[PDB]
């Protein structure tokens, strides 16, 4: 059984908890595992690390999303999406990458099950928005000072 598949899906819920509690996602995760018969501890632990990929710079991630929001707000409307968005980008570069287009879809497909399917359309599209912004946010490496 692809236990890892579940560990990844649960990632969003952790981020979702931040919207309500906004505290150490590590402790919060412990609360849900209790209700959700995750069982496969491997998955629960693996899941934790997965969400951390998002937390490696959560705030910056929002910023990363904002640069492409063309001014809009990641909060848009749907709540899940807002949190889910961070989890999707977590992969982008934070986790290196690896089939980014498909990576979001699965994650986004997960949203269809939880959050409205219509939101999934926006979730995937907006996810790619960060990708384009990344290539631009790459780096320019300015000169030490030259002044020569």
Curated annotation (Swiss-Prot):
Disulfide bonds: none annotated. Signal peptide: none annotated. It comes from the Bacteria. GO terms for cellular component: cytosol. Keywords: RNA-binding, Transcription, Transcription antitermination, Transcription regulation. The lineage of its organism: Bacteria, Pseudomonadati, Aquificota, Aquificia, Aquificales. Gene3D superfamilies: NusB-like. Belongs to the NusB family. Involved in transcription antitermination. Required for transcription of ribosomal RNA (rRNA) genes. Binds specifically to the boxA antiterminator sequence of the ribosomal RNA (rrn) operons. This is Transcription antitermination protein NusB. Coiled coil: none annotated. SUPFAM superfamilies: NusB-like. CDD domains: Terminator_NusB (cd00619). It comes from Aquifex aeolicus (strain VF5).
